[PDB]
């Protein structure tokens, strides 16, 4: 059923795809604000020991909600908090309480405000909280790699999380494409291996089909230490992720 799951994920990621360039329609918030919000969400997930899939789901919910709705400066953190709460409820075994998120917002919003924003996001998303993420496709690709290098997986997760910060240009790439580009970049970085033939057959993505996302992700990886948001780099510095953020990105991609 694994191939059926991959096909269903590829079909579903289109239906859960956020509108491309919705920040242009937003009159009050900009992509820098979204990057700051995603950095704070990474920090929050680290604080409450949330899984990476929860963070990816929260980012997807925020992107879709802001595609469908207009949010001011003072409500962007409320939207992010509601998305984090919804993702934790959907994914975590024991999601944090609403009071935990109210506290983690430095009491910017009350519990009633957080619950109202959660209701608004659920109404906007129409309870479509099962959106495929880069994490799921990355795990599916990890199931098709041998030998199973843990450094490859950690670097792929690091790059996939890095893709969440910048809406430009990672909102025009499907999560499967981003996951494939991250897997290839990690494989070339730590082992020098390219996009596997097994994944070529499974996903249909040749090394040329990932080339734009590959260049964008290589640029992000090279410029990661200089990025204004550094929460992901600190998070992946630990021995849990083998310290992949300390690894030197390849200077060039032999494509």
């Amino acid at each position: 059923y694994h191939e059926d799951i991959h096909t269903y994920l590829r079909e579903m990621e289109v239906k859960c795809k956020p509108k491309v360039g919705y920040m242009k329609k937003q009159p009050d918030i900009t992509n820098s604000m979204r990057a700051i919000l995603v950095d704070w969400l990474v920090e929050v997930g680290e604080e409450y020991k949330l899984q990476n899939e929860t963070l990816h789901l929260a980012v997807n919910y925020i992107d879709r909600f802001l595609s469908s709705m207009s949010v001011l400066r003072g409500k962007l953190q409320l939207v992010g908090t509601a998305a984090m709460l919804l993702a934790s409820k959907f994914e975590e075994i024991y999601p944090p309480e609403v009071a935990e998120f109210v506290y983690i917002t430095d009491d910017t919003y009350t519990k009633k405000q957080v619950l109202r924003m959660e209701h608004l996001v659920l109404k906007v998303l129409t309870f479509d909280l099962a959106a495929p993420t880069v994490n799921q496709f990355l795990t599916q690709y990890f199931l098709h790699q041998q030998p199973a290098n843990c450094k490859v997986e950690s670097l792929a997760m690091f790059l996939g999380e890095l893709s969440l910060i910048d809406a430009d240009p990672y909102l025009k790439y499907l999560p499967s494409v981003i996951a494939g580009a991250a897997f290839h970049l990690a494989l070339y970085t730590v082992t020098g291996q390219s996009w596997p033939e097994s994944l070529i057959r499974k996903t249909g993505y040749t090394l040329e089909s990932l080339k734009p996302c590959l260049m964008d992700l290589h640029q992000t990886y090279l410029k990661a230490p200089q990025h204004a948001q550094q929460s992901i780099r600190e998070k992946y510095k630990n021995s849990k992720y083998h310290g992949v953020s300390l690894l030197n990105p390849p200077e060039t991609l032999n494509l």
């Binding site: 704070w40 920090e43 604080e47 962007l76 506290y103 430095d106």
Partner: peptide
């Protein structure tokens, strides 16, 4: 830490 009110403005 992770507890902060983001001043987006």
């Amino acid at each position: 830490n992770a507890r902060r009110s983001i001043n987006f403005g």
